[PDB]
């Protein structure tokens, strides 16, 4: 973390997403623990994050790999393997970046952006996971994506549910949350010309819900050192840049109950002229969603190493 800011000669400029939660696949680390210096790394961060991780990468079923208290850190661990290489390979130099991480993959975000050290963060994701799945036992909560017809419409109904749009990602992608009970009652009647399926996820994530998870993930986002950022990072909240680094480990916190404005993030990229989009493991989803909300910008969906290779030049 020690850089020099490059010199225009007398727009060079690339989005970095770092993946959220349900996408993470059996054998997700595989392709990358195999290079040089990652079992070294990921042994350090599995003692530092205490679970397993090695093992959870590679023979580790989907199932034992979505329970939050997993399925965070484990994101995280394979987003900033990625990452680490793609730096190591020199094929970011001389580009303006811009980083914004979606849900969890915001503490990855921030990593990349410089704000935590790489090891810190995979802490900070376990804690976030084992805190949030101690909230989720309290009462039967969850999310339902809302495949959606009239904008208006769905935000009405949502309402008199008493459902947040958890996650807003794209028009028409919206994420409702809040008990069982009120998302069978959206299930059993949605708002016309719009579909509804119920994200096997163990909790309503981004409510208010998630109060008891507040301060055991508060206190360890204290205890954790932190730089001002090396890339524009951008935030969930409203998906303006964050500026000073207090700043955003405070928005951090509080994003933990509030609505992930993915949609506003991807606002925030169009209005940069981003040349290029680099997702990382396990992508899939946040360049789909910039596929088709970013015209024309190519964007890549990071699996394998072989993948960060046809960037040398963009």
């Known amino acids: 973390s020690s850089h020099h800011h490059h010199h225009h000669s007398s727009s060079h400029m690339i989005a970095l997403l770092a993946p959220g939660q349900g996408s993470q696949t059996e054998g997700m680390l595989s392709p990358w623990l195999q290079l040089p210096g990652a079992a070294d790394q990921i042994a350090a961060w599995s003692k530092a994050a205490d679970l397993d991780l090695a093992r959870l990468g590679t023979t580790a079923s989907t199932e034992e790999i979505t329970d939050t208290a997993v399925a965070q850190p484990l994101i995280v661990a394979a987003t900033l393997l990625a990452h680490q290489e793609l730096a190591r390979r020199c094929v970011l130099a001389g580009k303006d970046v811009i ?85 069978e009652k959206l299930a059993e009647d949605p708002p016309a010309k719009a579909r509804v399926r119920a994200l096997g996820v163990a ?15 508060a206190a360890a986002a204290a205890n954790i050192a932190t730089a001002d950022p090396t890339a524009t990072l951008l935030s969930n909240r409203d998906g303006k840049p964050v500026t000073s680094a ?37 992508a899939g989803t946040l360049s789909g969603i910039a596929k088709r909300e970013l015209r024309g910008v190519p964007a890549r969906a990071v699996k394998s190493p072989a993948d960060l290779d046809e960037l040398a030049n963009l």
Not at 140 to 160: C, H, I, K, N, Y
């Open 246 to 282: 207090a700043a955003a480990m405070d928005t951090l916190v509080s994003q933990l109950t509030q609505p992930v404005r993915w949609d506003l993030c991807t606002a925030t990229l169009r209005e940069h002229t981003v040349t290029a989009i680099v997702e990382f493991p396990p």
């Open 99 to 183: 980083v914004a991480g979606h849900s969890v993959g915001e503490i990855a975000a921030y990593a990349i952006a410089g704000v935590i050290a790489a090891d810190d963060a995979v802490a900070l994701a376990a804690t976030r996971g084992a805190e949030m799945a101690k909230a989720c036992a309290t009462e039967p909560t969850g999310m339902s994506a809302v495949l959606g017809g009239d904008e208006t419409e769905v935000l009405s109904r949502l309402e008199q549910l008493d459902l947040v749009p958890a996650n807003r990602n794209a028009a028409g992608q919206i994420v409702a949350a809040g008990r069982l009970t009120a998302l």
């Open 203 to 217: 909790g309503a994530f981004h409510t208010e819900f998630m109060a008891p998870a507040l301060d055991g993930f």
